[PDB]
Ligand binder design. Sequence first.
Ligand SMILES: [Mg+2]
Length: 43
Amino acid sequence: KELTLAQTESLREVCETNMACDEMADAQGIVAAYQAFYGPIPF
Ligand SMILES: [Mg+2]
C-alpha cells in the first residue's frame, strides 16, 4: 500500500548515501530503487 511521508523519507535517506541507488531512484522511483539495493521494504 501507499507509504506515509515519513516512511518515504526513511527510504530516501538510505538511498541518498548510496550513489548507485540515488541514480536509480531518479527514473525507477524510490521504492524499486530501495528494494533493488536493500530488499523488500520491511514496514
Ligand atoms: Mg530526512
